[PDB]
Amino acid sequence: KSEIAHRFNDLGEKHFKGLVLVAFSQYLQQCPFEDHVKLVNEVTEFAKKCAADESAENCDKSLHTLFGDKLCTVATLRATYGELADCCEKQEPERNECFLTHKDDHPNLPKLKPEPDAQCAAFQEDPDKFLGKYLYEVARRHPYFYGPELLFHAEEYKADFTECCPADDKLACLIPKLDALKERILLSSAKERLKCSSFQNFGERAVKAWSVARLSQKFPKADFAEVSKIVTDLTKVHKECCHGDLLECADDRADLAKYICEHQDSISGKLKACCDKPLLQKSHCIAEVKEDDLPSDLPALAADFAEDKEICKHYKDAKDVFLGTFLYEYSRRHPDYSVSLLLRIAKTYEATLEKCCAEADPPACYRTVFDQFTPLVEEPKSLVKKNCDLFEEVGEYDFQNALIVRYTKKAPQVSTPTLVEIGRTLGKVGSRCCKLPESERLPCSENHLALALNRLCVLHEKTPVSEKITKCCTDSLAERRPCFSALELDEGYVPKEFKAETFTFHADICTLPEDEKQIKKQSALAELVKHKPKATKEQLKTVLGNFSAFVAKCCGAEDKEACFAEEGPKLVASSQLALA
Ligand SMILES: COc1ccc2cc(CC(=O)O)ccc2c1
Ligand SMILES: COc1ccc2cc(CC(=O)O)ccc2c1
Ligand SMILES: COc1ccc2cc(CC(=O)O)ccc2c1
């Protein structure tokens, strides 16, 4: 009868309000917190009014009709969001489809820096409003954040402020906790942006293929019927809150958590801890659940997928279904393979049957299909061993520096801030994955590379500069990392016009936090590669060493500004000659 009433009844007032605020904040990122709270209230009031008499007028209307109508009431819409105001002319589903399009993944809003004194005072005088502020702030900085996951992260936030506002030291309790949370948000955001990116660019079939591989790894003892059910239900959950249907998304995610936990004995022995937790905790715990031990009775696949004489017959009859089965079974027995590698192997299996089932005697052709996988497995293992050997040797900052040089040579047209952010994110992959048991290194590395490279691809949709990057981002989801790995310096690139002020440093740097200095120095490294792109990585390491030395020296000088002014131009001059 009335959908708005249905969701309000199910989710509760608090969660309904939470998700509705996120939804509004994600669509309208530049509008004030004052304004969003009033739409949140007005909509909520309508849901209560509808939940009372469902037969009331306008209550029959869809969430999209109602949420999109409310978005067109917002003061100064044409002035602030001209691009988004045109959509308000259109009917549904055209209008929401129009809204979704005009979202910003890099809205350049100020860095989210904690103030222990002022925030604790805001939390005390009204916690409900203080938590609302958090949802708003993070939502407009991550327009594709997993809605119910945000409500979960907003509880971690509240848990930190409840612990640290009465405490003796208000900074030393709160500063490293909110930095760890900001770290966790960046990762949750990254995973859920790859999901939405995969829908936008490659489609539902691609997201399903990815989910089959991942869940098969996480739940190896689950039947193919069970894994299919969960993938079907999970893919609909992600499709919904990637498309802004946060009320639908939240309801469906809770149902799937309820399902996985009712059937946990047939799915995995790792879910017992997750299933005895509250609703938001439960959903988060399952999503991040440890992989189940391999079953003793795991079947041999050679007979079914290489030896059997009617494989072509099976394959031809229903391709997507047969391929699903192979993906399911091969992923189950390889928790030591990345998802992208499993999708690569599946695409090589598909290719072998396409070829072999055109020839005179197929069985003799596809008998050795599994041996076509060995080179696909050794390539990534090489790149992980090589990058981890480099990381453990030189550390996060130099490894990051090695990667900024690698990717600035690949895509020198890409902005320095973008190259630096990607180099630094790729550097974290070394820190996170190289320390893990070497069996867990490959999956960790490639699954986090997918996040880092999807970031780069998202930034590159906004400001396209490179046809090589476009091709790597749009061609094939499974072949992305290999595609990016394959890029070399463009021999037809014109070296950056040397601008002296680009490499000019002042005393301002000396007061900066550690990482903020790194960013400034790493920004300079990128600008060096752009001006002298044929310079060896060993040349660049030397020159930036000299830059670091110079900065440390002048920050410790009596007259810091005089030191930068006298030393700086000499260093820049001789740096040009060292990079020949
Ligand atoms: C374990 O950490 C890493 C970090 C960056 C990597 C980059 C690549 C991709 C490339 O070759 O450019 C491959 C493995 C990596 C492993
Ligand atoms: C149903 O089985 C599959 C297996 C591998 C797949 C890989 C991709 C990835 C890509 O096409 O680049 C997409 C769908 C798949 C479906
Ligand atoms: C400051 O520029 C750097 C720093 C460290 C690096 C390490 C490597 C690793 C290597 O030298 O083989 C490569 C480039 C770098 C660039």
Side-chain angles (χ1 to χ4, degrees), residues 1-33 35-112 114-170 172-312 314-315 317-366 368-384 386-490 492-580:
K1 211 170 172 65
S2 181
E3 207 68 53
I4 193 155
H6 179 67
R7 302 301 177 191
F8 182 57
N9 287 344
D10 288 346
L11 292 171
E13 187 177 16
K14 181 199 198 185
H15 282 193
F16 175 98
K17 279 199 156 217
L19 296 169
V20 162
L21 172 58
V22 167
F24 275 135
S25 309
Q26 283 188 340
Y27 277 74
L28 300 175
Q29 301 174 236
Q30 304 293 309
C31 278
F33 173 68
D35 292 10
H36 283 131
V37 159
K38 284 177 197 295
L39 298 187
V40 157
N41 286 4
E42 283 163 9
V43 162
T44 307
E45 287 184 54
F46 183 78
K48 288 171 159 182
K49 200 163 190 180
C50 283
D53 195 345
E54 300 207 16
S55 189
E57 196 186 285
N58 285 50
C59 285
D60 47 64
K61 299 192 186 181
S62 54
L63 294 168
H64 272 139
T65 304
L66 293 170
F67 175 84
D69 277 359
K70 206 76 216 178
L71 214 65
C72 298
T73 72
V74 180
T76 67
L77 188 69
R78 292 190 195 187
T80 320
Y81 309 99
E83 305 183 1
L84 206 77
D86 188 83
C87 305
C88 281
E89 220 77 41
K90 293 166 154 284
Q91 309 294 45
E92 297 285 12
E94 300 191 319
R95 175 166 73 181
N96 182 253
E97 196 66 6
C98 190
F99 275 120
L100 262 168
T101 294
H102 311 123
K103 282 206 166 186
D104 191 303
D105 275 279
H106 194 47
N108 289 357
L109 294 175
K111 206 72 63 175
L112 210 46
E115 298 174 303
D117 281 19
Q119 287 188 111
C120 278
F123 167 66
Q124 278 152 30
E125 90 187 348
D126 190 355
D128 272 0
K129 180 173 172 194
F130 171 74
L131 296 178
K133 202 78 153 73
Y134 180 79
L135 280 170
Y136 160 76
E137 290 288 13
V138 178
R140 63 169 187 172
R141 290 176 169 77
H142 303 272
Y144 291 98
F145 208 102
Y146 201 22
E149 197 68 336
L150 197 48
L151 302 208
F152 165 77
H153 280 305
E155 280 190 324
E156 292 196 295
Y157 188 70
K158 194 202 181 199
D160 302 350
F161 273 83
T162 44
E163 193 184 349
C164 295
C165 292
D168 299 21
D169 197 340
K170 210 176 300 297
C173 189
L174 201 71
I175 290 287
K177 270 209 178 82
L178 288 185
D179 285 2
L181 169 61
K182 194 179 191 304
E183 190 167 20
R184 279 196 303 275
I185 279 169
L186 279 174
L187 195 52
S188 269
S189 170
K191 293 184 169 184
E192 190 70 8
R193 191 69 191 87
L194 174 57
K195 268 148 187 148
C196 302
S197 289
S198 292
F199 280 116
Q200 287 179 37
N201 284 288
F202 303 105
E204 183 178 309
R205 190 217 174 211
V207 174
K208 283 202 189 189
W210 193 96
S211 301
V212 173
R214 194 70 205 91
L215 294 191
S216 297
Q217 285 181 311
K218 271 179 155 156
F219 311 134
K221 96 175 178 186
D223 300 314
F224 180 55
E226 202 103 56
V227 165
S228 291
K229 151 77 175 184
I230 293 161
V231 166
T232 297
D233 287 14
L234 185 60
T235 303
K236 181 180 178 160
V237 168
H238 297 317
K239 195 198 190 177
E240 277 156 354
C241 43
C242 288
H243 290 216
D245 308 353
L246 291 176
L247 297 191
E248 293 104 302
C249 160
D251 222 313
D252 285 340
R253 201 201 183 205
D255 289 354
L256 175 57
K258 168 179 166 184
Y259 173 76
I260 291 167
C261 282
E262 273 170 351
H263 294 62
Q264 69 164 309
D265 315 71
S266 82
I267 305 178
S268 167
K270 301 300 192 178
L271 294 169
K272 188 192 151 196
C274 299
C275 289
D276 282 299
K277 291 188 157 83
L279 163 57
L280 288 186
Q281 275 84 332
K282 186 149 70 185
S283 295
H284 170 90
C285 186
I286 293 159
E288 300 305 311
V289 70
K290 195 151 285 183
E291 294 168 330
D292 205 0
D293 288 322
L294 294 192
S296 299
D297 58 16
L298 266 175
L301 314 167
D304 313 88
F305 295 104
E307 304 180 0
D308 192 59
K309 293 292 193 181
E310 296 297 324
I311 287 179
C312 296
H314 309 325
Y315 174 54
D317 279 20
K319 289 166 182 260
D320 269 17
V321 189
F322 190 79
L323 281 164
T325 317
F326 171 81
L327 183 54
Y328 160 77
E329 281 290 15
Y330 197 95
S331 302
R332 276 176 79 179
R333 63 184 288 176
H334 290 109
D336 60 339
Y337 294 176
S338 64
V339 179
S340 57
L341 172 53
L342 283 163
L343 295 179
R344 253 177 268 139
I345 288 170
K347 263 185 72 186
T348 293
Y349 183 79
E350 179 182 28
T352 305
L353 295 186
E354 272 301 322
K355 177 175 61 63
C356 288
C357 300
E359 301 190 5
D361 284 322
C365 183
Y366 63 64
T368 66
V369 59
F370 276 69
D371 297 65
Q372 311 318 315
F373 305 165
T374 185
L376 287 169
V377 179
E378 293 321 314
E379 190 247 331
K381 277 174 172 273
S382 283
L383 292 187
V384 165
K386 187 197 295 164
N387 279 305
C388 279
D389 292 340
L390 172 60
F391 167 80
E392 279 151 31
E393 186 180 317
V394 309
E396 190 168 313
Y397 166 74
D398 271 14
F399 184 55
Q400 280 177 357
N401 288 354
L403 290 163
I404 287 176
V405 167
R406 200 180 292 164
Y407 274 80
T408 300
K409 286 185 190 273
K410 284 170 185 284
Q413 315 99 311
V414 175
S415 82
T416 299
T418 290
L419 290 168
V420 168
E421 192 203 325
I422 300 313
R424 285 174 68 77
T425 298
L426 290 174
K428 290 174 198 175
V429 180
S431 305
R432 169 173 266 277
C433 300
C434 295
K435 65 177 163 58
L436 298 172
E438 284 84 358
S439 81
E440 293 174 25
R441 268 187 178 189
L442 165 56
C444 185
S445 302
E446 264 210 332
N447 291 346
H448 277 81
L449 283 175
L451 305 189
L453 290 176
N454 188 63
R455 177 51 168 168
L456 173 52
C457 287
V458 159
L459 289 183
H460 194 272
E461 283 184 55
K462 186 196 173 62
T463 308
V465 297
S466 197
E467 289 206 285
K468 296 191 291 175
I469 295 172
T470 291
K471 284 179 183 186
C472 280
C473 291
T474 64
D475 276 355
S476 168
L477 173 55
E479 275 299 324
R480 248 194 202 167
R481 196 284 306 154
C483 186
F484 270 107
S485 278
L487 297 177
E488 295 297 332
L489 168 56
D490 207 313
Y493 173 70
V494 192
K496 188 96 166 277
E497 332 84 19
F498 179 91
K499 194 146 211 164
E501 204 81 336
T502 307
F503 310 102
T504 298
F505 285 83
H506 290 288
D508 59 323
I509 200 168
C510 305
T511 65
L512 286 178
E514 185 64 27
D515 55 318
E516 283 196 44
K517 293 189 192 176
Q518 280 180 354
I519 288 175
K520 281 222 177 291
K521 291 209 267 76
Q522 278 167 338
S523 297
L525 176 58
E527 290 295 346
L528 289 174
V529 174
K530 292 190 179 170
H531 171 233
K532 289 301 201 165
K534 282 177 181 169
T536 67
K537 58 211 177 83
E538 302 95 344
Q539 270 167 298
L540 293 157
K541 181 182 176 161
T542 305
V543 166
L544 194 79
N546 296 318
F547 265 83
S548 283
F550 155 61
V551 166
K553 167 198 273 196
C554 290
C555 292
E558 205 283 7
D559 197 346
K560 295 172 197 196
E561 192 38 52
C563 185
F564 285 105
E566 164 76 4
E567 293 299 337
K570 286 166 173 281
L571 175 61
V572 175
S574 89
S575 292
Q576 296 205 237
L577 292 173
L579 291 184

